[model samples]
Target: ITGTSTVGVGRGVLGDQKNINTTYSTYYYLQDNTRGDGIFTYDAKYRTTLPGSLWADADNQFFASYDAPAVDAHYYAGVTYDYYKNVHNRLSYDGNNAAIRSSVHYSQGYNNAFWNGSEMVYGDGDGQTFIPLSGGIDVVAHELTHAVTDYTAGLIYQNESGAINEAISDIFGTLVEFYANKNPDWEIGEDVYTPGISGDSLRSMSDPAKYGDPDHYSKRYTGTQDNGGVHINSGIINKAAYLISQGGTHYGVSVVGIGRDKLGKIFYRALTQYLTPTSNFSQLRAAAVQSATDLYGSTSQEVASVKQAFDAVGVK
Candidate 1:
């Protein structure tokens, strides 16, 4: 990807036009050398392939409708990378400026996206359920945050630990959305979740119960499905995070909103410094409390609010 950096204009999956950083050799490639080593995007060609091939364009402009997904993937990857480096002071997911990679149009009508342990992968949904998942900045950030979790906390991918893993992604993903300041909300995947439905999301941090997700730990699922309900039970932690950022009264407990920047710092510190692979909800509670105390003071309201946020969600 080492080449002359160029700028290209293209529409995203939602048909919004924007400019992206790219590379130009003989032909234009979807590689943004401006960020870290480079942020590269590939085309999966509607197949179940891993990094199918580097996406190429004959011209430096990416105006074709078919190129929308790839354009957003490359652009959003850079945005997420910037969020980590600029906000957290972390170099990259690995704290070493690892080159970000992404693939679009992965498998025909695929309905989900994931980190897949290394590079980011996006699905072109069946149009009803989703379009290109990369279209949503939150969705893109959510997937990349999994990589962040992998390199840092390395939360075990099952049971309570796995739920923490999922919640971390959702929390940071939503934080990155707010950092970008684009129609920021406490919902995940709202932009690309379902085009036909408005005001609905894959998950809601403000109120996880809206989508049958537990806002209180008492309702968490203990079944052995979905890697031990990682997605299902993350709601408890997500609710706690939302309360920390935005003050709320949940059940009978109340929290004082400390704002997003502080929330990011507290969670980032907990993930990078306190959390271990098997950390459960109680461990996460302690980590957040310690992180808040370290950043603010043992007797600070930030610390007390952190305690209350977890208590509100019944994360004892």
Candidate 2:
């Protein structure tokens, strides 16, 4: 985790923030330099941002290159770190205790930041649609949580299994957002991208209806152009999680219920404690509801919501 602070400058080619002022001269890339090879790309923007960033003061800095973070990007990273550690008592990426590894300024105009199993890779947004992917809490958490999913459920990224894999990330991502921003809304990626076309952020959990697409499970995933819309059909799982978190036991809550905090625990437990690498929707639903029951009792509002949301989505 980065212990240094950085000053965010103005926008770059894509109109997103660039040019960072760091407290130190450099930063490390990834969590542990166990590989001992540097992966950051040195640039003029990196040098300019070193003056005020934590890179100057961090004991074991994690940013390797002079990569700078947008204003919200750094904040979101810190927020996500705290969320995982505080919420699940997980130190960082590795359950055995490990720090995070993040690389920014990945490509000239790249708009995606991904967790490639071992480390984080960030891209500079085209500035036409999405902003720096790092700027969003859910986005940051979304990538890192993928690693969590891999280590746990290891759910395959196809069909309903793919949806479950994606859903688990969205659930943790939104929980990180709510955990960081404390926004009662529990929406996803509300503050990440600077959408010039898509109406709102990529997804919305509070109201999946806002996306104006069906929330039911189907063999045909949404947005075939993008890996069967692992990032799109995810809405179903996101809402299911939202409903479960809010204490909507049995999918038919006469009224709204709890919070993402409750839902995250249930999902995480289901993923880590109860699922297999190839688990599908039915298995996932059963696992989640079972997890909720173990925590809050079968009659608990949490259990009902988890169960109902699965039923509402035709899991039963």
Candidate 3:
């Protein structure tokens, strides 16, 4: 849609008020031209469609109950975009300022969100399980990070590689949450998961075993379910990442805390430069070590901590 760039006020799924970028041709459209090429949001209207109609508003105010998901989806996409651009100096998911697109209200009681190769799709959860998924900044970023992974490492989404892919999303997702300064923690999907429960998340980076996920390679799941337990096995790598950013001792091995900025740099460098479609846990450890060496030094604390973190997780 062609229009003058405009700002709109809206309340997100959590009833928090914020401003969103909109385009006004005749009616206000949820097409933001401010970041990169653009960030376009669409309404799935509770159907299984790809990028449904571009969200439109009669007034530039989006406080209506039905508009909550779209507001958050549009707003958080921009936040994730800003996080990559400012923190990593990457333009967008493709590193070339590719236009970001998303669709909310994907289906009736659909309790998931994913990047469908071309764009993002968010589901409105059944009240008991989840609310609108886009309400969670980490969830939004996790999906977008998949796009980043696809363009860079292209990690094969199966077995160990799949787990690494999942962990990369979780790592970057939590980082984006921290970048936005919104109650940052090493938890995934805590904001929009199980509205009835508090202090629980879909997964934990600090302690993946809290949800019965393997924190060590020795405890990894080798079953055929979940594409070789990609989500489940991601805990091994997620724990190592958390230990790198925040020091911790696991299985009698200790890692020195190196903070989050260096963690992002090393992982970003590895993802963009060293990781391949079939890289496994051992290969990931090597990539992180080399990435740290490149950014810091061969004997620097960053590289040492990277080695220690992977060792602590039994990744070798």
How good is model 2 by TM-score?
A: 0.74
For all predicted structures, in order, the TM-scores are: 0.99, 0.74, 0.99
Candidate 1: tens digits of C-alpha lDDT, residues 16-87: 888998788888899988877788999999998799899999887777878999988998888899999999
| Model 3 spans with C-alpha error above 4 angstroms | none
Poorest stretch of ten by lDDT in candidate 3 = 49-58
Candidate 1: residue pairs that collide: none
Ordered from best to worst TM-score, the candidate numbers read 3, 1, 2
Native RMSD of candidate 2 (Å)? 6.7
115 in model 1: Cα distance from truth in Å?
A: 0.5
List model 3 lDDT by residue over 258-277, tens digit each. 99999999999999999999
Q: Please give the lDDT score at residue 47 for candidate 3.
A: 93
**lDDT at 272 for candidate 1?**
95
Better of 2 and 3 by lDDT: 3
Give the whole-model CA lDDT for all candidates, comma-separated: 0.91, 0.61, 0.96
